[PDB]
Amino acid sequence: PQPKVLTPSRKDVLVVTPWLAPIVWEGTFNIDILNEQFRLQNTTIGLTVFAIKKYVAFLKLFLETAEKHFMVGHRVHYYVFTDQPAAVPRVTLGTGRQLSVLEVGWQDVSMRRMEMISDFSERRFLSEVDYLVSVDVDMEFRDHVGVEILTPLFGTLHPSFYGSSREAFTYERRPQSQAYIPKDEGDFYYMGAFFGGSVQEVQRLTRACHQAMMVDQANGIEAVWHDESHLNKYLLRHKPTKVLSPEYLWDQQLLGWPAVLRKLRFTAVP
């Protein structure tokens, strides 16, 4: 189809940020063009997920549905971080897709995701993949999540806050925290449950967030929303090159199916 210059791709939502990063909604991309571009580079995507304690029960539906909807036709390597490696379900994968189990050994728990993704992103990952994506396990894919998301650095608009003014955002507001964001600053509220980028940019974001959380621990402070607060401070200073709409992170029981969402792609399990 010919793009039409004098017809907006969307009339109801912002599709580009003020620093010229695309905000990814249905209707803004031609997946066949993008699929070609990324297949020409033999793109490999690493997906990291933590499944700790009773959350290992969510892995079966998470993986089954990732096989139906996540990066189908591209190279995918899943990295499952778990305290129960023997409890990872044996899900059959499509060609070009592999899964590795990485065993994990309260503020240390809070720092775990950034610390562990940082250590891992400098090892295995760094050889094994082009992009890394971090998501939570208590979720299911219901629709396409593909190479439209890939870029050097991305965050995802939090589904509770996309229509909120910045004063309402639940940033860390105590100047004593490394995650501090003043009341007059901030572009969006990004959710900790879906972020990613190139392996280099994920190394940088996770090192910065881990090192920031350690400084806060030394000072006796825990940011209001833990590594999400540090994610938002990082993405305020280092602006993402794409932003995913809440199509990519939704809770239907909580929030229904608003008119602005043409697809619910990755959703909370109720």
Ligand X SMILES: CCCCCCO[C@@H]1O[C@H](CO)[C@H](O)[C@H](O)[C@H]1O[C@@H]1O[C@@H](C)[C@@H](O)[C@@H](O)[C@@H]1O
Output the known binding site for Mn(2+): 136, 138
Q: Pick between residue 17 and residue 160 the one whose CB is nearest to ligand X.
A: 160
Residue 208 C-beta-side C-alpha neighbours within 13 Å: 19
Q: Pick between residue 13 and residue 104 the one whose CB is nearest to its own copies.
A: 13
> Binding site: which residues?
50-52, 55, 136-138, 158, 170, 228, 251
Catalytic site residues?
228
Amino acid at 136: D
Q: Does 15 bind its own copies (CB under 8 A)?
A: yes
Q: Does 7 bind its own copies (CB under 8 A)?
A: yes
Tell me which of 85, 94, 163, 256 binds its own copies, using CB under 8 A. Answer: 163
Contact region for ligand X (CB under 6 A) — 42-50, 104-112, 147-155, 156-164?
156-164
Residue 251 interacts, among its own copies, ligand X, none and using kind-specific CB cut-offs from 5 to 8 Å, with: ligand X
Alpha-carbon distance 252 to 93, whole Å?
27
Q: Checking DSSP bridges between strand 75-82 and strand 97-103, what pairing results, if any?
A: parallel
Backbone angles phi, psi at 94, to 5 degrees: -75, 170
Query: Is there a contact between 187 and 236 (Cβ–Cβ < 8 Å)?
Result: yes
Residue 220 burial (CB count, 10 A): 8
Q: Does 231 bind ligand X (CB under 6 A)?
A: no
Q: Does 211 bind ligand X (CB under 6 A)?
A: no
# residues contacting its own copies (CB under 8 A): 42
133 CB contacts (<8 Å, ≥6 apart)?
A: 45, 46, 47, 48, 149, 194, 195, 196
Q: Residues in the site for its own copies, rule: CB under 8 A?
A: 1-24, 28-30, 33-34, 37, 148, 157, 162-163, 165-166, 186-188, 239, 242, 260
